[PDB]
């Protein structure tokens, strides 16, 4: 009875949160599988998740619960355990289970920035021209919904390990902050990141990019493409081939969000566009605005 009234006030808060803006996003470091004994503000409305999942957070319900959703099509808002609640549940398990011898959430941009790597190194013609055609395509295809921005700062330095002049490190931080700001209103964000040739270069940052691997499957083809750009590029063959082989050595499922191994620009573009449309849907659930009826019933 005190409890049915509390559930009502909780449900109502959830209702109102459907159409609020996303306050921030997290990437999870742990898994959470909801149980009845977690004492969810509305029973059955907890958001379960696996490690490495993304959540959009609307608001703080209390010290134990936030309100938000999994970034996935079909998923609607519910209650997400706060770090305090996750730690309390962890200790409940440890207490039930029982001299000299890990945050559950990282804050990430609300839209994961897209970053292109491959087919070889940036600053050489084959990779620069191939990527330029993809960026030109994105600009036209997602007009009104996208921000594409160059990043010349070395954003691989954006880890606590680092957090080089004082001025350069402040510039890296200001670029991170800019990229978070570009994503705040849920536009797609595409970075032309001069210094990033390999996904491991961003894996320790809080950017949580969408890594797009522009992959030339055959090294023989790559070599001949470099040669097509003349002796001035071909004299740099080795460094370009080594870089392409490092990409090919990565565990693909864990390293790349999208792999463009199509040999036709049209097909590579439509694959990337299909991916990004799907990501648009995941991040923009229809529930985030109510229709405003044209006609009233009476």
């Amino acid at each position: 009875a005190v409890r049915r009234e509390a559930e009502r006030q909780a449900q109502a808060q959830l209702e109102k949160a459907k159409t609020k803006p996303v306050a921030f996003a997290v990437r999870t470091n742990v898994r959470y599988s909801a149980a009845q004994e977690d004492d969810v503000p509305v029973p059955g409305m907890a958001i379960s998740f696996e490690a490495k999942d993304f959540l959009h957070v609307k608001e703080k319900f209390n010290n134990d619960w936030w309100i938000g959703r999994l970034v996935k099509e079909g998923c609607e808002i519910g209650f997400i355990p706060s770090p305090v609640k996750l730690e309390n549940m962890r200790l409940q398990h440890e207490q039930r289970a029982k001299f000299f011898k890990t945050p559950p959430y990282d804050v990430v941009p609300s839209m994961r920035p897209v970053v292109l790597v491959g087919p070889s190194l940036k600053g050489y013609e084959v990779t620069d021209m191939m990527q330029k055609a993809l960026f030109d395509f994105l600009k036209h295809r997602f007009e009104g919904r996208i921000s594409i921005t160059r990043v010349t700062a070395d954003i691989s330095l954006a880890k606590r390990s680092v957090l080089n002049t004082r001025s350069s490190l402040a510039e890296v931080q200001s670029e991170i902050e800019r990229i978070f700001e570009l994503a705040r209103t849920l536009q797609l964000v595409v970075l032309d990141a001069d210094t990033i040739n390999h996904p491991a270069q961003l894996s320790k940052t809080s950017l949580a990019p969408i890594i797009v691997y522009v992959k030339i499957s055959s090294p023989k083809v790559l070599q001949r493409l470099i040669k097509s750009r003349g002796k001035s590029q071909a004299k740099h063959l080795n460094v370009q081939m080594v870089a392409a082989d490092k990409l090919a050595q990565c565990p693909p499922q864990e390293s790349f969000d999208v792999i463009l191994d199509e040999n036709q620009l049209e097909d590579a573009c439509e694959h990337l566009a299909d991916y990004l449309e799907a990501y648009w849907k995941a991040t923009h659930p229809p529930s985030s605005n109510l229709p405003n009826p044209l006609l009233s019933r009476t």
Partner: peptide
Amino acid sequence: ASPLEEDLCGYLCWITQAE
């Protein structure tokens, strides 16, 4: 053309579209 020649042509065409 062989798959490798087809790959190569597709990529060379892709590069021309960047200019």
